[PDB]
């Protein structure tokens, strides 16, 4: 459990580094966001199963539902970006600087 | 800072203990200013809606003044209770901790030697 939770935290940190460090694909950025979501699910589930906290067992389902609604809204925004600009490259969304 | 005190019943505008306090005298500068702000609000609203400033919406101006005085009176009662309970907790803590607040034997202007700085 300590090594497992340490590498889970490192997986979250790597997914956060990928989310912060953009490449050309907003789709890849969203995928990094759900990498963070999945790491959070795994950490919460492992903690609840280790502590035998059946009162806190609703928390993984809660984060799954809420972050999945988040992902659906983000997919809708990516759809709007792609429909507006043909492609979903993130460098096109820069006309609000001025 | 006072939200964690003992006997703090949650989300109470005016607890019953506050009823031991003197109410505002209902003609005091704070409530008079609240009524003046209500009247100025009505006048400014008349100007912004492009009506006669004093000759239009007399019921509206009366409603503004009355609502401002009402809200100011009850908020002033709550604030008076808050200041009173702050002072009461302060004096209670001072009484309960007398070693931390010693009376200083403050001495006269006959033994202390204030330095003299001439202006010349």
């Amino acid at each position: 459990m300590p090594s497992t939770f340490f590498n889970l935290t490192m997986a979250f940190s790597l997914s956060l580094l990928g989310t912060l460090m953009f490449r050309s694909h907003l789709m890849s950025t969203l995928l990094c966001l759900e990498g963070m979501v999945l790491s959070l699910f795994i950490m919460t589930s492992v903690t609840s199963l280790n502590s035998n906290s059946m009162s806190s067992m609703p928390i993984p389902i809660t984060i799954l539902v809420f972050a999945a609604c988040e992902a659906a809204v983000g997919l809708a925004l990516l759809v709007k970006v792609s429909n507006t600009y043909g492609t979903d490259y993130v460098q096109n969304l820069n006309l609000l600087q001025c | 800072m006072m939200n964690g005190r003992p006997g703090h019943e949650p989300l109470k505008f005016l607890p019953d203990e506050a009823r031991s306090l003197p109410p505002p005298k209902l003609n005091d500068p704070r409530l008079v200013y609240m009524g003046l702000l209500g009247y100025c609000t009505g006048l400014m609203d008349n100007m912004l809606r492009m009506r006669p400033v004093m000759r239009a919406g007399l019921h509206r101006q009366l409603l503004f003044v009355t609502s401002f005085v009402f809200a100011g009176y009850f908020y002033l009662k709550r604030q008076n209770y808050l200041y009173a309970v702050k002072d009461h907790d302060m004096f209670g803590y001072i009484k309960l901790h007398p070693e931390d607040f010693p009376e200083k034997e403050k001495k006269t202007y006959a033994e202390i030697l204030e330095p003299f700085h001439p202006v010349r």
């Binding site: 580094l17 912060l20 460090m21 953009f22 993130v90 969304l93 820069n94 006309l95 600087q97 | -």
Partner: protein
């Protein structure tokens, strides 16, 4: 003393300083890639500051 050097020294120099610095701080390109690289730098610096402060 009035129309050249005190005016160059106090008010116009403060105005020029703040104009240069506001150009520097509002030279933003509007790219969320650069913005999130900036946010990553902020995260690294705050983590380092916590590590050295403890």
């Amino acid at each position: 003393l009035d129309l050249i050097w005190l005016e160059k020294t106090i008010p116009k120099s403060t105005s020029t300083l703040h104009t240069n610095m506001t150009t520097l701080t509002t030279n933003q390109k509007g790219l969320i890639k650069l913005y999130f690289m900036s946010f990553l730098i902020n995260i690294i610096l705050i983590i380092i500051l916590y590590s050295i402060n403890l």
